[PDB]
């Protein structure tokens, strides 16, 4: 029911530039957002729950932030740039709706 | 750490239904409920539903109200998903996951050519 949209779906080539993957939901979200990492057709798992804290089995280089409707995850030091889709799932109410993104 | 080992391959006749299984030995199966989600082209990833193994209670998406039926067996500690009225639009990879979507299985990659 709650449509999930991303402010940026494709990242333009910008070396040494500010990185922020944002998600804009249909209505406000009380920080019930999940961040999902996945390798090439493998290693699908989440990293951040509640938009701020990590899964505790992943290194602290991942860091999410935001308040209200727009939540952005930032990358401190990028190490690789490959084709790997991202996910942006809200948890306010049923059903669970995911998002999308392209990073790393 | 959690791993799910399934059959390497399966041979089926043309236009024959298939059932996907995923072992849940990584945790206490009867404690955490397992969700089902599928990703399809032009529609991103859409949630299908969830099953609570202890009592069999389920909640289904508005699209998947009758598309699939989810059950489980405590004898071998696994859950099963049954799909009726199979069609071309139903061809999509389905991956189950534990409560909170923390642990994900290794869904197969179907390819005809």
């Amino acid at each position: 029911a709650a449509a999930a949209a991303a402010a940026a779906a494709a990242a333009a080539a910008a070396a040494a530039a500010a990185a922020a993957i944002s998600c804009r939901a249909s209505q406000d979200i009380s920080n019930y957002l999940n961040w999902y990492a996945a390798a090439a057709a493998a290693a699908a798992a989440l990293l951040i729950y509640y938009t701020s804290r990590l899964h505790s089995e992943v290194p602290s280089r991942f860091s999410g932030s935001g308040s209200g409707t727009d939540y952005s995850l930032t990358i401190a030091a990028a190490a690789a740039a490959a084709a790997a889709a991202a996910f942006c799932q809200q948890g306010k109410t049923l059903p669970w709706t995911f998002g999308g993104g392209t990073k790393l | 750490a959690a791993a799910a080992a399934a059959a390497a391959a399966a041979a089926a006749a043309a236009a024959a239904a298939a059932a996907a299984a995923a072992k849940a030995s990584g945790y206490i199966f009867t404690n955490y409920n397992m969700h089902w989600v599928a990703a399809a082209a032009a529609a991103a990833a859409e949630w299908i539903g969830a099953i609570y193994p202890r009592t069999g209670d389920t909640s289904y998406n508005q699209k998947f109200k009758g598309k699939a039926t989810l059950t489980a067996d405590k004898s071998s500690s696994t859950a099963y998903a049954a799909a009726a009225a199979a069609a071309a639009a139903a061809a999509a990879a389905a991956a189950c996951a534990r409560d909170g979507f923390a642990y994900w299985a290794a869904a197969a990659a179907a390819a005809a050519a």
């Binding site: 509640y50 899964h55 | 609570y52 409560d99 909170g100």
Partner: protein, 332 residues
């Protein structure tokens, strides 16, 4: 010696680490909770607030509640220091609830969704429906009748005897308080003290849970929970939903599963207020578990928290009466 800052008669170290009362030869004395000796005899571990004379703010102290130096009319469910002991008075009449929102959606949605479109209005004022005074609480009313004389209104008892003799917004005007004397076993009623000066404190400092697992009757029990804002409320021991159900409603687990007279916990439905649902959802998201029934042991209770638990197999209405049920259950 012991500090006993709260001056409750129980050492504060015992109130923190846990304590219990055991009798050796017809003589009672407190002892720190020791496993393999006290557990096998059915003694219940008791935890209280080291800075509060009464943890639940009820007129009875922790020492009086535990050691039995309390008015004998107090219900055994209120003997726990963490359970409030306050009267509830009412008048085919039955107990009613102020308002209900859950019921339009699926009954099984509580497993995967908490709060949001489902809630329930809670009001501390007594209410009833029709189509004789009854004390459904855990404390007596002695000398003053409510507004909708030496005899009392004992809990779980009617003001007139059974042999003797569409809303009723009963007011909470109760009588005085019978306080147990320490110098002797005599019990005296303090005219100056009143229930109306104690009920507001109990409402503020305790979390109210309503249950209808027996006779389809709503029982109102409150559990002393921790309020982070108030430093004194933090002194209360940590309370989980599993422990609150076990100590209030008689829930027991023989093999890790909560049961009530043979009925599993999953057979009941959970309802929360707006603030309660928000707090519960925050805890669930932090703990990475959308399901609540299987994380009951790790869900903390806070002050000003209201939880309503119903029966799934019965169909309820706006006033919370099981007007109907499923076809199978009514047939058999």
């Amino acid at each position: 010696t012991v500090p006993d800052r709260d001056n409750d008669g129980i050492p504060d170290s015992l109130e923190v680490e846990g304590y219990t009362v055991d009798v050796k030869n017809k003589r009672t004395f407190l002892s720190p909770w020791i496993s393999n000796i006290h557990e096998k005899k059915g003694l219940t571990k008791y935890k209280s607030s080291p800075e509060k004379w009464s943890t639940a703010s009820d007129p009875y102290s922790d020492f009086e509640k535990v050691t039995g130096r309390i008015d004998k009319n107090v219900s055994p469910e209120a003997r726990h220091p963490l359970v409030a002991a306050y009267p509830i008075v009412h008048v085919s009449t039955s107990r009613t609830h102020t308002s209900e929102v859950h019921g339009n959606a699926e009954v099984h949605a509580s497993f995967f969704d908490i709060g949001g479109s489902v809630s329930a209005g809670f009001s501390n004022s007594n209410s009833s429906t029709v189509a004789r005074y009854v004390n459904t609480g855990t404390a007596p009313i002695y000398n003053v009748l409510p507004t909708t004389l030496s005899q009392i209104l004992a809990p779980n008892n009617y003001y007139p005897s059974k042999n003797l003799a569409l809303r009723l917004d009963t007011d909470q005007v109760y009588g005085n308080i019978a306080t147990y004397n320490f110098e002797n076993g005599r019990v005296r009623v303090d005219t100056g003290s009143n229930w109306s000066e104690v009920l507001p404190q109990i409402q503020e400092t305790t979390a109210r849970i309503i249950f209808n697992g027996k006779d389809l009757n709503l029982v109102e029990r409150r559990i002393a929970a921790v309020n982070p804002s108030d430093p004194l409320e933090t002194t209360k021991p940590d309370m989980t939903l599993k422990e609150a159900l076990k100590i209030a409603f008689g829930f027991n687990e023989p093999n890790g599963n909560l049961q009530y007279q043979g009925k599993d916990i999953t057979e009941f439905d959970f309802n929360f207020d707006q603030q309660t649902s928000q707090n519960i959802k925050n805890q669930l998201a932090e703990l990475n578990a959308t399901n609540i029934y299987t994380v009951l042991d790790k869900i903390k209770l806070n002050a000003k928290m209201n939880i309503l638990i119903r029966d799934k197999r019965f169909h309820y209405d706006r006033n919370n009466i099981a007007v109907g049920a499923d076809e199978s259950v009514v047939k058999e």
